[PDB]
Design a protein around this ligand. Structure first.
Ligand SMILES: NC(=O)[C@H]1CCCN(C(=O)C2CCSCC2)C1
Ligand SMILES: [Zn+2]
Length: 140
């Protein structure tokens, strides 16, 4: 589990969105596994607006932040899970690292801010949904 809190937005994995998220919906995209809801309180996270390909992510199943090198956002084939059939997920970046069921939502960050959140795992790989192109997260 996990979310990004920027401005008056909460960014979560679409597959983990709550009823309150859906009832206060700003934007959702199943192809990216992302959903953004509105919040009453202002958040403290800042979104990275950069071209970093190295950063650090939080892995809840290890209680640890790991440094990783990750691929550029791309259209990657993801196997069927209990949340989606086997399909192409867009704006996904892969790295070598631990990601098991429950790690979705952990933040990937660089020196500039938040880059994305854990969205896929298994096989010693971890995939992150990028958020750096969602410029509107920085404004009202
Ligand atoms: N964004 C997605 O399509 C993900 C939805 C949740 C399931 N998923 C995974 O990668 C898990 C990783 C741990 S082993 C089981 C498969 C894919
Ligand atoms: Zn950066």
């Amino acid at each position: 589990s996990g979310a990004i809190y920027v401005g008056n937005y909460r960014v979560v994995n679409r597959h983990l969105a709550t009823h309150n998220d859906w009832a206060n919906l700003v934007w959702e995209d199943s192809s990216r596994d992302l959903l953004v809801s509105s919040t009453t309180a202002q958040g403290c996270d800042t979104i990275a607006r950069c071209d970093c390909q190295t950063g650090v992510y939080y892995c809840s199943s290890r209680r640890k932040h790991y440094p990783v090198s990750f691929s550029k956002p791309s259209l990657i084939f993801v196997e069927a899970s209990e949340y989606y059939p086997a399909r192409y997920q867009s704006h996904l970046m892969l790295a070598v690292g631990h990601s098991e069921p429950g790690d979705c939502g952990g933040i990937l960050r660089c020196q500039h801010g938040v880059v994305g959140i854990v969205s896929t795992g298994g096989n010693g790989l971890v995939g992150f949904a990028d958020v750096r192109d969602l410029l509107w997260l920085d404004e009202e």
